[PDB]
C-alpha cells in the first residue's frame, strides 16, 4: 500500500523528524533559511541581469548592414579570383564565408575553384599560411 494522495511520508524523513528532540523545528528551519538564501540569490541575478539588459538597449540596429541580393554566376572575373585567394588566406576552408565574400559564387563553385586553380594560385601554400594562425 501507499500513503493517501498528496501525503508524503518517506521512511528516511520519518526517521529524520523524530531522530532527536526538536529535530522537527531544526529540519523545518534549515529549509526556512535555505529558502530565504535562494530568494536573495534570485534578487542578485535579477538586478545583475537588469543592468546587462540595459546595456543592450537599442539592440544592434545602428550596426546593421543592408541585404546584398546577388545572383550566382559561372564566370570568374580576374577580380573575384583575387577576392577568392585573399578569402582563402583569411578563412581557409569556410567555403560559406568565402562564398559570402565573393558574393556571386555558390559554395560548390568555391569548392571547384580550389581544385581547378589549385596549381595556379599555389592554394596549398595559401592554406598552410592560414593554418599557421
Amino acid at each position: 500500500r501507499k500513503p493517501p494522495k498528496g501525503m508524503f511520508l518517506s521512511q528516511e524523513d520519518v526517521e529524520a523528524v523524530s531522530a532527536n528532540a526538536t529535530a522537527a523545528t531544526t529540519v523545518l528551519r534549515q529549509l526556512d533559511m535555505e529558502l530565504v538564501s535562494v530568494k536573495r540569490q534570485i534578487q542578485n541575478i535579477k538586478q545583475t541581469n537588469s543592468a546587462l539588459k540595459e546595456k543592450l538597449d537599442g539592440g544592434i540596429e545602428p550596426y546593421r548592414l543592408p541585404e546584398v541580393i546577388q545572383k550566382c554566376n559561372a564566370r570568374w572575373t580576374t577580380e573575384e579570383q583575387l577576392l577568392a585567394v585573399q578569402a582563402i588566406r583569411k578563412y581557409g576552408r569556410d567555403f560559406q564565408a568565402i562564398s559570402d565574400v565573393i558574393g556571386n559564387k555558390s559554395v560548390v563553385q568555391v569548392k571547384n575553384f580550389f581544385v581547378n586553380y589549385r596549381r595556379r594560385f599555389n592554394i596549398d601554400e595559401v592554406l598552410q599560411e592560414w593554418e599557421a594562425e
Binding site: 500513503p3 493517501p4 511520508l9 523528524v17 529549509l31 535562494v38 543592450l56 550596426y63 577576392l83 585573399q86
Partner: protein, 666 residues
C-alpha cells in the same frame, strides 16, 4: 441482509460458519461432517430469527421445534442443544420478555453482583432467569450508573450515555423493541463557527475535514507500513503520529518551494550567462562596424586588397549580426519561461493559522469520541474495535436512556446506597463487605458462591484502592488495569424557554482559538423535544473544566452562543447541569480507551475470572469465584452500552455453566 442469514448478522454471528464458542460446545459437530454443520448453522440461525422476530415473549424449545421443518426437526437433541446454548449465552431470551414458564420456585447458588450498571443488570436478569439467587450492590442511590438521565419539569437530558450507534447487529435493537425508547435519528450535518462567531465557508469546511481524514489514513500508513510504533523505548501515540505526519507535510511544502525557486535561479543564471554573451558580441559588432565604415570610407577606384577588406568586414559583420539575432531569440524563450515559473508557485503554506484551528476542532471531536487526549491513544490500536461497528444511522433516546436500566432493574434484588469496600474470595466461597453510603459505620456482609465485579475501570484503578481484594488480584490482572486507559468527557445541559437555534440543525460546532483549548465547549446538540442545548467538553479541556464553577462554565457557553446567534437571541437558561465524571467516585471517568502500550488483548485479560488458591494445601483445584464484566471487559465493543449489556450476558452464561452445569456440551 435478510432471512435466517439476517438473524446471524443481526446477532453478530457469521451465518455460514461455526464460531469458536460454538466449537467448544459442539465439538462433535464442527469436527463432524460438513452436512451436519450446515444443519447446525441453519437450526441456530432459524432459532435466532424466531427470537428476533418477537423479542417480547420467551422462545421455548417446544416453540422452536414447532417452527422447524424436516430434515431439521428430525434430530431433537441437536435442536435442544442449540436452543439451550443460545439461551444460556443470552443470544435469545435476554432483556425484558414474558416468561412462558414462570421461574422455578427453588433457586440454586447465590451470586453477588457489584454494581447496578447495565452490565450488572443484564447479568442479574440472566442469572435470575436461570434460577439463581442474585443480589446487586450499588453505591449510588439509583440504577444505570454511567447511564444517567437528568429530569426536571419537562426537561429531559442524558448526562451519561445518549447514542445508539446503529441498529445493524446491535443488541439494543432488541431492547428497543422490548422497551419504549423514543428513538430519533441524528442528522449528521454539523456546521462550524470560528472564535468570532461566523460560520466556516463550505470550501474551508470541506477542505480541512478532508485533510483531517487524510491525516488519519496517514497515521495508519506509518503504523502498518513503516512500523512506526515504538520511539525511544516508549509506545507511539496517535497524537505523536499526527504531529509527525503534519510536520512532514509542512516539510514537503518547503522542499517544494525550494525546488521551484531553484528552478528559477538555475534558469535566471542561464539568462545571465547569455546576456554576457550578448553584451560582448554587441561590443565586437560595434567595433567591427566602425572598421567596415572606415574601410568603406576609402573611395574607389581601389586595389583589390582594399576591396577585399570592405567585403570581408561586411561578411564578418553580417555573420556576427546572425549570432546576436539567434541569441536574441534564445533570450525571448528564457524570459517567458521565467514568467511561467513566477506565475506557477507551489503552495505558500501547508495549513494557515485559521485552518489549523478548524483542524483542531476535528481533532477535538476525535478526542471527544475516544474520550481522551490523542496523546494517550495507542497509535496501532485506538480504533481496533471499529471493524465491529454496527450499520444504520446513529440515534438518540429522546425520552432519556434511564428508561433502559430502570426497565432491566424490575424484579431484581437491588441494594441501593450500598458501597462495596472489600471482596474476599476463597475455595469454599466469597464474602463481600459493604457499608451504607449515608452512614459509613453501618456495615453489611454478604456470603455467596460467586462475585461478579462490574466496578468501572476508573474505580479498579483507584489509588489508594476504593475496594480491597482478599486475596489481592493477581499481577496479570492489575497490570492490565494500569495499562488500559480510562478516559473522560463531560456534558453541560442548557435548558431554555425558547428555541433560538435552527430546529433543522441537530448539532453544531464552535472552533476554539488555541490547540490547548480545542475541546472546551467545542460542540452543541439540539436533540430533544424541549428547548435544550447540550454543550460538550472533550480532550485535555474536560479534566481542567471540572475545577470551574457551574456558573462560569454556563457563562462561557452563553458567550459562545451570543457569538453564533447574536447577543439578543440567547436568554438566560432556566435550568443548568454540568457533569464531572472524573470527579464522580462511583465511576472515576467516562469510559475506556486503548491507551498507548495497551492492546485489545488487555480487555480480554479483564474478563478472565479469578480462581482462588485451595483452602487446605494439597486439596484439589477450586472453582473460579471472582468474575468480571462491564465495558472494559468486552474487547470488540468497549466504551458502549451494548458492550456493557453484552459483557453482562456473557458472564451470566459463564457463571451458570460453572454453578448450574452445562447439559448441552454432550
Amino acid at each position: 441482509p435478510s432471512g435466517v442469514e439476517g438473524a446471524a448478522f443481526q446477532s453478530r454471528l457469521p451465518h455460514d460458519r461455526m464460531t469458536s464458542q460454538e466449537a467448544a460446545c459442539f465439538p462433535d459437530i464442527i469436527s463432524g461432517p460438513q452436512q451436519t454443520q450446515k444443519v447446525f448453522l441453519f437450526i441456530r440461525n432459524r432459532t435466532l430469527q424466531l427470537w428476533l422476530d418477537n423479542p417480547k415473549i420467551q422462545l421455548t424449545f417446544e416453540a422452536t421445534l414447532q417452527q422447524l421443518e424436516a430434515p431439521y426437526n428430525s434430530d431433537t437433541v441437536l435442536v435442544h442443544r442449540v436452543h439451550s446454548y443460545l439461551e444460556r449465552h443470552g443470544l435469545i431470551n435476554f432483556g425484558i420478555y414474558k416468561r412462558i414458564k414462570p421461574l422455578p420456585t427453588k433457586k440454586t447458588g447465590k451470586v453477588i453482583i457489584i454494581g447496578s450498571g447495565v452490565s450488572g443488570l443484564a447479568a442479574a436478569r440472566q442469572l435470575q432467569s436461570f434460577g439463581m439467587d442474585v443480589t446487586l450492590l450499588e453505591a449510588r442511590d439509583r440504577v444505570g450508573g454511567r447511564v444517567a438521565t437528568f429530569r426536571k419539569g419537562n426537561y429531559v437530558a442524558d448526562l451519561g450515555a445518549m447514542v445508539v450507534t446503529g441498529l445493524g447487529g446491535n443488541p439494543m435493537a432488541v431492547v428497543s423493541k422490548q422497551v419504549n425508547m423514543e428513538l430519533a435519528k441524528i442528522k449528521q450535518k454539523c456546521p462550524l463557527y470560528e472564535a468570532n462567531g461566523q460560520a466556516v465557508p463550505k470550501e474551508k469546511d470541506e477542505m480541512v475535514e478532508q485533510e483531517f481524514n487524510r491525516l488519519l489514513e496517514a497515521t495508519s500508513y506509518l503504523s502498518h507500513q513503516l512500523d512506526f510504533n515504538v520511539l525511544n523505548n516508549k509506545p507511539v501515540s496517535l497524537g505523536q503520529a499526527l504531529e509527525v505526519v503534519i510536520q512532514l507535510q509542512e516539510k514537503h511544502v518547503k522542499d517544494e518551494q525550494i525546488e521551484h525557486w531553484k528552478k528559477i535561479v538555475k534558469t535566471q543564471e542561464e539568462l545571465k550567462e547569455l546576456l554576457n554573451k550578448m553584451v560582448n558580441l554587441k561590443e565586437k559588432i560595434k567595433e567591427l562596424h566602425q572598421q567596415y565604415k572606415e574601410a568603406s570610407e576609402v573611395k574607389p577606384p581601389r586595389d583589390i586588397t582594399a576591396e577585399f577588406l570592405v567585403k570581408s568586414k561586411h561578411r564578418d559583420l553580417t555573420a556576427l549580426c546572425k549570432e546576436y539575432d539567434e541569441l536574441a531569440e534564445t533570450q525571448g524563450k528564457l524570459e517567458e519561461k521565467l514568467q511561467e515559473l513566477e506565475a506557477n508557485p507551489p503552495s505558500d503554506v501547508y495549513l494557515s493559522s485559521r485552518d489549523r484551528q478548524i483542524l483542531d476542532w476535528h481533532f477535538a471531536n476525535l478526542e471527544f469520541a475516544n474520550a481522551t487526549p490523542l496523546s494517550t491513544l495507542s497509535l496501532k490500536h485506538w480504533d481496533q474495535d471499529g471493524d465491529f461497528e454496527f450499520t444504520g444511522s446513529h440515534l438518540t433516546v429522546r425520552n432519556g436512556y434511564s428508561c433502559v436500566p430502570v426497565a432491566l432493574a424490575e424484579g431484581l434484588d437491588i441494594k441501593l446506597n450500598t458501597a462495596v469496600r472489600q471482596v474476599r474470595y476463597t475455595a469454599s466461597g466469597c464474602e463481600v463487605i459493604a457499608v451504607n453510603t449515608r452512614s459509613t459505620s453501618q456495615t453489611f456482609i454478604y456470603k455467596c458462591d460467586a462475585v461478579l465485579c462490574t466496578l468501572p475501570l476508573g474505580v479498579l484503578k483507584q489509588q489508594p484502592p476504593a475496594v480491597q481484594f482478599v486475596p489481592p488480584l493477581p499481577e496479570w490482572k492489575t497490570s492490565a488495569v494500569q495499562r488500559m486507559g480510562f478516559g473522560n468527557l463531560n456534558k453541560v445541559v442548557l435548558c431554555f424557554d425558547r428555541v433560538f437555534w435552527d430546529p433543522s440543525v441537530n448539532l453544531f460546532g464552535h472552533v476554539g482559538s488555541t490547540t490547548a483549548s480545542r475541546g472546551e465547549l467545542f460542540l452543541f446538540w439540539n436533540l430533544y423535544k424541549a428547548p435544550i442545548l447540550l454543550a460538550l467538553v472533550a480532550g485535555e479541556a474536560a479534566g481542567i473544566m471540572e475545577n470551574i464553577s457551574d456558573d462560569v462554565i454556563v457563562g462561557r457557553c452563553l458567550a459562545i452562543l451570543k457569538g453564533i446567534f447574536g447577543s439578543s437571541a440567547v436568554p438566560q437558561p432556566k435550568e443548568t447541569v454540568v457533569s464531572r465524571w472524573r470527579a464522580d467516585p462511583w465511576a472515576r471517568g467516562s469510559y475506556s480507551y486503548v491507551a498507548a502500550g495497551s492492546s485489545g488483548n488487555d480487555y480480554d485479560l479483564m474478563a478472565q475470572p479469578i480462581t482462588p488458591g485451595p483452602s487446605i494445601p494439597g486439596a484439589p483445584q477450586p472453582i473460579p469465584r471472582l468474575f468480571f464484566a462491564g465495558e472494559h471487559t468486552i474487547r470488540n465493543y468497549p466504551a458502549t452500552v451494548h458492550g456493557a449489556l453484552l459483557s453482562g450476558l456473557r458472564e451470566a452464561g459463564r457463571i451458570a455453566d460453572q454453578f448450574l452445569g452445562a447439559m448441552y456440551t454432550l
